[PDB]
Design a protein around this ligand. Structure first.
Ligand SMILES: COCCO/N=C/c1c(N)ncnc1Nc1ccc2c(cnn2Cc2cccc(F)c2)c1
Length: 280
């Protein structure tokens, strides 16, 4: 069964991870051996089970997969626990130990994961560094795709990560996801800064129309920054394609010190923070 129907007893919400944008995520154990899992708690659930199947049918090393679902009073989404937490918090905590090699590789990995979703005709709708998880320092994965639509994202909100056409018309495409990719990259390059910090969400569409964009990160060469800016063009068709982003950042990954200037570039443990891996 691709989307395993789990019984209220097979798993248990041990601790709390964090209050998300669509629900609360817990850390826990699952017994179909005990497997560490992330549990997100948000008769007509036939609708959900549909968009839920998609989330479980993805198979790419850069995209999290939904492993199970529990349909009771509430819907609980069960996935494999990523021990290092989300990338946003990761870069914030290692702001002085993250080299250009890692930063570029993550951009490549996020780009591959996004290209994979585009091949499945799945618009994420909420890509951001907080929705990129760290399996290990050299392996990151995209998560939380599809939930946005499954709750009326484009029905009658992460404004600062959204493309202009999404804010004004609720239009979501793989190209609006490219814009958010641009913002996600900005978050990594600034080591976790909040985009448009100190600017009211209501004024965002206004500043974007006037041509204003997030500033060039200190460590970025104009070449890296040019890619981000292209991702934020009003004309969605003119923005880079994830496929082109994979190739461009891969190229830069071969000569990192040339595209990112990080002083001393070359040269808390999530054990006490956070049985067999779901992968096992
Ligand atoms: C501020 O710091 C917060 C740190 O929280 N880290 C949390 C977390 C984690 N350390 N490991 C794994 N998942 C984590 N969250 C998380 C994110 C999305 C989720 C679930 C469960 N269901 N869904 C929907 C979904 C949609 C599409 C594909 C999927 F696989 C899952 C859990």
């Amino acid at each position: 069964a691709l989307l395993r129907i789990l019984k209220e007893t097979e798993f248990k919400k041990i601790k709390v991870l964090g209050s998300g944008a669509f629900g609360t995520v817990y850390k826990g154990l699952w017994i179909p051996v005990k497997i560490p899992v992330a549990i997100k708690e948000l008769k007509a659930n036939k609708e959900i089970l549909d968009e839920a199947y998609v989330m479980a049918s993805v198979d790419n090393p850069h995209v999290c997969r939904l492993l199970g679902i529990c349909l009771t009073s509430t819907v609980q989404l069960i996935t494999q626990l990523m021990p290092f937490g989300c990338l946003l918090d990761y870069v914030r905590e290692h702001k002085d130990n993250i080299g250009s090699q890692y930063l570029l590789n993550w951009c490549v990995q996020i780009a591959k994961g996004m290209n994979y979703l585009e091949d499945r005709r799945l618009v994420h709708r909420d890509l951001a560094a907080r929705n990129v998880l760290v399996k290990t320092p050299q392996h990151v994965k995209i998560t939380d795709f599809g939930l946005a639509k499954l709750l009326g994202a484009e029905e009658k909100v992460p404004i600062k990560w959204m493309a202009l056409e999404s804010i004004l018309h609720r239009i979501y495409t793989h190209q609006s996801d490219v814009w958010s990719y641009g913002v996600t990259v900005w978050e990594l390059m600034t080591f976790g800064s909040k985009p448009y910090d100190g600017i009211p969400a209501s004024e965002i569409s206004s500043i974007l129309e006037k041509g204003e964009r997030l500033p060039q990160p200190p460590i970025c060469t104009i070449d890296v920054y040019m890619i981000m800016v292209k991702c934020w063009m009003i004309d969605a068709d003119s923005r880079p394609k994830f496929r082109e982003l994979i190739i461009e950042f891969s190229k830069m990954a071969r000569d990192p010190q040339r595209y990112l200037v990080i002083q001393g570039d070359e040269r808390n443990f999530y054990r006490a923070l956070m049985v067999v891996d779901a992968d096992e």
